[PDB]
């Protein structure tokens, strides 16, 4: 009962922590302690507070090792707090809107979980993808957020090897995962297809790539065809969204496309059918909660791997409960 | 970098598996199960919910350990979520309370740390004590929240001898911690101080044991005077609230009226000024979020007990993250 019951707090107050951190970035503290900005009373002049109320906030943090030190020699960053910081790559765009957006969708998740309107839009009244396009400067942020899972990005051409190789990154978007493939490794070469009229993003994520000559773009229906003759045939979250017809269809362009020997890599958090991973079923809910989405296990998407004619030979967890399945011709 | 990144997303997504326990308390979802009421789809039929989402729900809280099961043999409770049913004792109504008021408190929590002016004044347009002094329904629940506490209270008699002793609960409120005493030693015998007029709940709350005469309320100024001859004088969340001067009078009040070899006991959250725990720090900026209030350090009372012409005899740690501090005469 006692630990149950410690456990239990630790779990209800666990949003008060978010909160927090939430503050702390947008406060902008990990880049003004960075700065050597480091007392309650620094702090509090900078960022328009008081030094008892900074000093309490600091007091939880630290306690937390999400920043370190004391008011006296002075607070600093530890690795999670560097995350927080108003540079390239790092978690701080995520955090915010987390602690916006998704603060705001999780708010109705009650009436969410009984009408099977997420909680998204019961709190924005329309679907996510819809308010990226609507809400002025929504998309931009968003893709800032989403930045923070080339985490899982970055790993794939360390597990894959790309040297000499093509590959086609199918249903692209923004490019960051070709971009993160191209970055990495110098030889390979990348086509990006999306739907026509859909590459302007790509087009100027991607432009140094594409001034190299490293990237092209393609407009097309994926369902239709797919660009051909490449040796690794990524597919990041596309599955999810598709039906077992759909994704056949997209199988089997895929596997007729490429070359010989080729491979279709999938990118996308799948769900263990048995111990599922706390963080990939927390992930799984918040899916619903953002836009009704919904996952695979890891067993139906190699089982429909194998319906659409490969062979699985590589199974691997990436950052942030992703998984890449890596199939070859059966 | 993987080990921070993956740290700073269980802080920040927290917040969601505050929101999924709030929602399986909401729906009665351990009631239903304790009765028998344990697939996805008797439980979706019984909440207006579809068998899907009770699934993906359910999975999660699982994987926290907060049930356990599945749906095909059936969900049972846990230790953990035994503490969700309504049932006298658990923290069903302080969930409830802390993802309702207390959500909407901590939603500003940025512009509240900012301007000194706590998130639930700024949620609610009303400082938190008027608003449940005004609002009886949230007032009410209030009570019920705070019910979680009685953990400590109950070790209270546990901890101290009550036997054939006589106690003065000094600010007791509704008076939950004389009726823990009294009910755990039926041989105790028990003055209650509020302030005249405050006195209605715990008439109320009291109704059985006031009847039994085993405990009798007094309307009077704790500053100006308190009961004479208690062998224990508990001062329970009170000194929190107390500036230097007022302290010192109530402790002057206790150390005159006391009878010899008799105690004071401060019953109170403090926060350890080395190494605090974390969780007695995030209740800090709680208290602040809530109605602007803050917690002392062990040091801070221990020091103005000694102020008081009181010697600390005894420092013990109570469930969660209260404290309870025994002093006698100097």
Redesign the interface.
């Known amino acids: ?5 410690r ?17 702390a970035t ?2 902008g503290l990990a880049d003004l302690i960075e700065s050597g900005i480091d007392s309650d009373e620094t702090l509090a002049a900078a ?4 030094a008892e ?2 000093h ?2 600091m ?2 943090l630290v ?4 920043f370190q030190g004391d008011t006296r020699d002075g607070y600093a960053n ?3 707090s ?3 910081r108003d540079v390239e790559g790092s ?1 701080r765009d ?2 915010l809107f ?2 916006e957006e998704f ?1 705001a969708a ?2 109705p ?2 009436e969410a ?2 009408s ?1 309107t997420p909680g998204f839009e019961l709190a924005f009244g329309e679907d996510f993808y819809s308010y990226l396009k609507r809400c002025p400067d929504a998309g931009r942020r968003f893709l800032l957020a989403m930045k ?1 899972s080339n ?1 899982a990005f970055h790993e794939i051409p360390r597990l894959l090897d790309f040297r000499g190789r093509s590959f086609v990154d199918v249903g692209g978007g923004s490019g960051e995962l070709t971009k993160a493939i191209l970055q990495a490794e110098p030889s390979a070469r990348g086509v990006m297809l999306d739907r026509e009229g859909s590459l302007g993003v790509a087009r100027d994520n991607l432009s140094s790539l594409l001034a190299g000559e490293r990237v092209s773009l393609v407009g097309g229906d994926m369902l239709q065809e797919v660009p051909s003759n490449g040796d690794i045939y990524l597919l990041s979250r596309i599955i999810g969204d598709l039906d077992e017809a759909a994704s056949l269809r997209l199988l089997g362009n895929c596997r007729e496309a490429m070359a010989g020997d080729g491979r279709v890599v999938v990118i996308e958090r799948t ?1 263990s059918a048995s111990e ?4 990939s ?2 992930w ?3 899916l ?2 953002a836009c009704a989405g919904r996952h695979r296990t890891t067993e139906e998407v190699v089982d429909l791997l194998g319906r659409g004619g490969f062979a699985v030979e590589r199974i691997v967890d990436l ?2 409960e992703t998984r890449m399945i890596v199939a070859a011709r059966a």
Not at 1 to 5: G, K, S
Not at 276 to 279: E, G, T, V
Request: glycine content about 6%.
């Open positions: 009962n006692l630990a149950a019951a456990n239990l707090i630790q779990v209800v107050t666990g949003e008060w922590k978010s909160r927090c951190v939430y503050v947008r406060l960022v328009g507070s008081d109320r900074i309490r906030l007091r939880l306690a937390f090792e999400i530890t690795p999670t560097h995350l927080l978690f995520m955090v987390y602690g603060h999780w708010t998740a009650c979980l009984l099977g923070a985490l769900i599922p991973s706390p963080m079923v927390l799984d809910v918040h619903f909660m950052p942030m």
